[PDB]
Ligand binder design. Structure first.
Ligand SMILES: CC(C)CCC[C@@H](C)[C@H]1CC[C@H]2[C@@H]3CC=C4C[C@@H](O)CC[C@]4(C)[C@H]3CC[C@]12C
Ligand SMILES: CCCCCCCC/C=C\CCCCCCCC(=O)OC[C@@H](O)CO
Ligand SMILES: CCCCCCCC/C=C\CCCCCCCC(=O)OC[C@@H](O)CO
Ligand SMILES: CCCCCCCC/C=C\CCCCCCCC(=O)OC[C@@H](O)CO
Ligand SMILES: CCCCCCCC/C=C\CCCCCCCC(=O)OC[C@@H](O)CO
Ligand SMILES: CCCCCCCC/C=C\CCCCCCCC(=O)OC[C@@H](O)CO
Ligand SMILES: CCCCCCCC/C=C\CCCCCCCC(=O)OC[C@@H](O)CO
Ligand SMILES: CCCCCCCC/C=C\CCCCCCCC(=O)OC[C@H](O)CO
Ligand SMILES: CCCCCCCC/C=C\CCCCCCCC(=O)OC[C@H](O)CO
Ligand SMILES: CCCCCCCC/C=C\CCCCCCCC(=O)O
Ligand SMILES: CCCCCCCC/C=C\CCCCCCCC(=O)O
Ligand SMILES: CCCCCCCC/C=C\CCCCCCCC(=O)O
Ligand SMILES: CCCCCCCC/C=C\CCCCCCCC(=O)O
Ligand SMILES: C=CCc1ccccc1OC[C@@H](O)CNC(C)C
Length: 443
């Protein structure tokens, strides 16, 4: 268009190049310097951030210059090289996302649950394989000119040193699209939906209570100002910190000084959960209700006993009677008309919803590891939304042959490009990344 558009378009493309580079240098630097972030998952995020940095340094600037100058001023060699790097970055990105998905599946299905079954050495070998293989499928069909179209509009462009329009033959456009994008995308969407199914399915009382009670390795006052530690382990109703430290030292079996380990908090929690279940089976009012309930609803009843005690929950005569008669909404009404709901409304709401539904939908993405899984699914969904329009319109115009245009192809390709700037923002969801960024940016 006119000067006003070229300047404004020039500024916008400069900001996108700056945002992609700064953002991805930051991500790579944070994982390179902070030991806590040196995980198998973040080695794959490093693979992803490298592809995005290469996209930002070697692809997007030469593409921007091509749009603004309305020509290619870098010659036929950098044209074929540029095209290949661009193809390599998209392929390496999507295949890395597919590896993350498969790795998260094998983790969630193992006794370890949230830990990769890979060693950091094995993860490095896989990243190297993804890049070597995607580099072979990106650079060989282009340097060998297997991609080349045979119509004169394309042929003139290949010969014209100042033309760098990505004309392909239909078999390359289909073949490269499926192996580079559609195959890993379909696998990633199928495997990661199961990851999300598994996290929800494998929710249990330990995770449910870890969510509701939280974790504190140091003494704190609860809702009622009673001294507590770990995962909702009440130490004493006494208003003395010494009394609470004595009870702590007796329970743990050593001089704690009001501080316990993760191993010690987990051990107490197992005792408390086991006492809550035994208390249910011991109590004649709770045992018939517990027997009539399903696995998810039993956990909601364990949660209540863990918080208020066997005697406390046994006071809910109407609610327990209707839970037994499977009258969930009537049970839920009576449970809300209690001191328990007024004292702890967010926790009572989740327990009442679990009784109402019989599902884990209230505890959905509440655990730190499940929020980590949600973050990875956002990375995958954003990539798909940004790249799928380009790849769909690309495959449609191979069948149909017409209405492809140039202004549409470039625009949808730039939707994909702008995705390299998005992942650093999504990593801010992780508190570990948020801390690294504020440190590196000296905030
Ligand atoms: C333009 C093309 C030719 C250059 C491609 C850059 C290559 C060399 C980059 C891109 C992604 C990179 C990998 C990103 C992730 C990791 C995990 C990290 O813990 C060690 C290094 C390792 C294994 C990197 C090695 C180098 C790598 C494969
Ligand atoms: C981001 C990168 C932006 C590159 C902008 C610099 C390229 C120079 C500006 C483009 C231009 O005005 O030229 C068009 C005609 O004069 C062609 O003959
Ligand atoms: C590029 C993304 C990095 C931006 C910095 C950030 O979001 O960190 C959190 C702090 O700003 C909160 O104080
Ligand atoms: C531009 C190209 C790459 C940008 C990423 C920079 C690479 C990151 C450098 C790693 C570093 O900061 O050193 C830490 C040492 O203590 C070793 O652990
Ligand atoms: C199909 C392409 C997927 C590539 C397969 C990647 C392997 C992986 O992610 O690790 C899983 C391990 O836990 C198995 O030991
Ligand atoms: C803005 C883009 C957000 C969409 C990405 C996505 O599909 O994430 C997976 C979700 O199911 C996570 O809740
Ligand atoms: C492009 C302009 C360069 C400005 C750099 C800056 O603002 O410093 C970074 C701070 O966020 C560091 O605290
Ligand atoms: C708008 C500005 C765009 C500037 C673009 C890129 C610069 C990226 C640099 C920002 C990352 C800083 C990393 C850092 O602080 O480095 C610590 C050092 O490596 C400790 O040894
Ligand atoms: C230009 C390519 C720059 C990308 C190359 C930098 C990536 C290397 C890296 O992130 O290193 C991680 C470290 O080796 C983990 O221990
Ligand atoms: C010109 C190239 C522009 C940007 C890439 C260089 C930025 C990398 C600086 C490294 C700082 C660090 O050690 O983390
Ligand atoms: C390839 C590895 C397959 C991962 C198992 C997925 C099975 C499923 O989604 O139900
Ligand atoms: C297909 C289109 C978009 C799906 C986005 C990819 C994210 C993984 C799927 C997980 C899910 O089903 O919620
Ligand atoms: C929405 C996309 C946002 C920014 C991308 C800017 C690049 C525009 C590419 C189209 C240029 C053209 O009309 O040829
Ligand atoms: C046929 C579509 C090109 C393609 C094939 C395989 C993998 C990725 C692909 O497309 C990425 C685009 O960003 C390339 N951009 C061109 C080279 C300007």
């Amino acid at each position: 268009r006119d000067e006003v558009w070229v300047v404004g378009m020039g500024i916008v493309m400069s900001l996108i190049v700056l945002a992609i580079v700064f953002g991805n240098v930051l991500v790579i630097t944070a994982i390179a310097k902070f030991e806590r972030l040196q995980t198998v998952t973040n080695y794959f995020i490093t693979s992803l951030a490298c592809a995005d940095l290469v996209m930002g340094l070697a692809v997007v600037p030469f593409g921007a210059a091509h749009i603004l100058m309305k020509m290619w001023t870098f010659g036929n060699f950098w044209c074929e090289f540029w095209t290949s790097i661009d193809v390599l970055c998209v392929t390496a990105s999507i295949w890395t996302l597919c590896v993350i998905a498969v790795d998260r599946y094998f983790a969630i299905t193992s006794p370890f649950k949230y830990q990769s079954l890979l060693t950091k050495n094995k993860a490095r070998v896989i990243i190297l394989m993804v890049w070597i293989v995607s580099g072979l499928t990106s650079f060989l069909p282009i340097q060998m000119h297997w991609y080349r179209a045979t119509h004169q509009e394309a042929i003139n462009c290949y010969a014209e040193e100042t033309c760098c329009d990505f004309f392909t033959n239909q078999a390359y456009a289909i073949a490269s699209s499926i192996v580079s994008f559609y195959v890993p995308l379909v696998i990633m969407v199928f495997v990661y939906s199961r990851v999300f199914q598994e996290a929800k399915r494998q929710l249990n009382i330990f995770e449910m209570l870890r969510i509701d009670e939280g974790l504190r390795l140091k003494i704190y006052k609860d809702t009622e100002g009673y001294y507590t530690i770990g995962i909702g382990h009440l130490l004493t109703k006494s208003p003395s910190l010494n009394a609470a430290k004595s009870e702590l030292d007796k329970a743990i079996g050593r001089n704690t000084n009001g501080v316990i380990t993760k191993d010690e908090a987990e051990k107490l929690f197992n005792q408390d959960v086991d006492a809550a279940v035994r208390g249910i089976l011991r109590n004649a009012k709770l045992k018939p209700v517990y027997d009539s309930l399903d696995a998810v609803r039993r956990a909601a009843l364990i949660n209540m006993v863990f918080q208020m005690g066997e005697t406390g929950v046994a006071g809910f005569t109407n609610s327990l009677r209707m839970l037994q008669q499977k009258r969930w909404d009537e049970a839920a009404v009576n449970l809300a008309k209690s001191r328990w709901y007024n004292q702890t409304p967010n926790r009572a709401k989740r327990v009442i919803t679990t009784f109402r539904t019989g599902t884990w939908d209230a505890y959905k993405f509440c655990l730190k590891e499940h929020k980590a899984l949600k973050t990875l699914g956002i990375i995958m969904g954003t990539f798909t939304l940004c790249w799928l329009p380009f790849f769909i319109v690309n495959i449609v115009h191979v069948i149909q042959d017409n209405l492809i245009r140039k202004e549409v192809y470039i625009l949808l390709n730039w939707i994909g490009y702008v995705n390299s700037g998005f992942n650093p923002l999504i990593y801010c969801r992780s508190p570990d990344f948020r801390i690294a960024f504020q440190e590196l940016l000296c905030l």
